[PDB]
């Protein structure tokens, strides 16, 4: 849970501007767009990183390349790699980060409009963020479906298979016989309808606020290299302040910087620590963390 700054440079001043914006607009809400970066401190192993037990187990299983684990065609040809990844990444195996709790705090302070997440760890939800305020753009393990006919399955059937040694006889649909998999969006598949539908509504929400208070969109821990999620930042209204908290300047913040864009090169947990301090919610935050 303990964090430190990424470099000798202080980000407190840049973070302060954010707190200042909120102080001036007490009735405004914030929309977060987050990625894998906010869960790194949770110890979630990156399947794309050598030196991680998961990466090597997938390699041993003959997975051709990391993202083939999230490819429908490969899954149907050999589901073991995905089942192996599921066993290690199944929700409940990790705990929320300080940043995840920051989202909960904003919710408590009623300043959270929505959190769009590319992560499949569901740590936002595990941390207490309400279902109505979360958009899991890439799905989750909360639901299972047949990739053939779409019949719905409770997640428990799939999960039970993960505790077997070895993992074999994968879950098959009792209607059409095809493989059943968690409602995780695989590469090549469309995102859930709620993604575009909710962005449509939040987009109108953002624009109508420009003409009233002034909202704020904060992008955190994402390389903005996966679409269509990566298209959101550029679609943010020109007149709505954008903030990017990432170790590196990426995506639209790099391709088409905007005068009001506020770039903060900092670890998400340190960012959270500094923001709570500047907002003056250390007391409430400390409570959530000790809850």
């Amino acid at each position: 849970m303990a964090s430190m700054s990424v470099s000798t440079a202080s980000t407190e001043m840049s973070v302060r501007k954010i707190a200042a914006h909120m102080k001036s607009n007490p009735n405004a809400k914030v929309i977060f767009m987050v990625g894998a970066g906010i869960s790194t401190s949770c110890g979630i192993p990156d399947f794309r990183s050598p030196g991680t037990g998961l990466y090597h187990n997938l390699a041993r299983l003959k997975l051709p390349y990391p993202e083939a684990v999230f490819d429908v065609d490969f899954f149907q040809s050999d589901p073991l790699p995905f089942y192996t990844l599921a066993k290690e990444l199944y929700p409940g195996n990790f705990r929320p980060s300080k940043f995840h709790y920051l989202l909960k705090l904003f919710q408590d302070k009623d300043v959270l409009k929505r959190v769009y997440t590319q992560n499949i760890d569901t740590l936002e939800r595990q941390a207490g963020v309400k279902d109505d305020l979360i958009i899991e753009a890439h799905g989750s393990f909360a639901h299972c479906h047949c990739i053939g006919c779409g019949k719905v399955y409770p997640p428990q059937v799939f999960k039970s298979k993960l505790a077997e040694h070895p993992i074999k006889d994968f879950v098959k649909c009792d209607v059409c016989g095809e493989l059943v998999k968690p409602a995780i969006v695989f590469f090549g598949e469309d995102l859930p309808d709620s993604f575009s539908e909710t962005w449509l509504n939040d987009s109108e929400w953002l624009r109508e606020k420009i003409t009233t208070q002034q909202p704020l969109v904060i992008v955190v821990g994402t390389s903005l290299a996966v679409y269509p999620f990566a298209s959101l930042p550029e679609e943010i209204p020109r007149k709505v302040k954008r903030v990017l908290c990432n170790l590196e300047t990426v995506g639209d913040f790099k391709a088409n910087k905007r005068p009001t864009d506020l770039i903060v090169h900092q670890y998400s947990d340190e960012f959270a620590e500094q923001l709570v301090e500047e907002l003056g919610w250390q007391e409430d935050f400390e409570k959530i963390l000790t809850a």
Binding site: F186, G188, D190, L191, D193, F195, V226, Y227
Partner: peptide
């Protein structure tokens, strides 16, 4: 709606 999950 944006198309399928991808890097493109």
């Amino acid at each position: 709606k944006g198309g399928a999950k991808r890097h493109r």
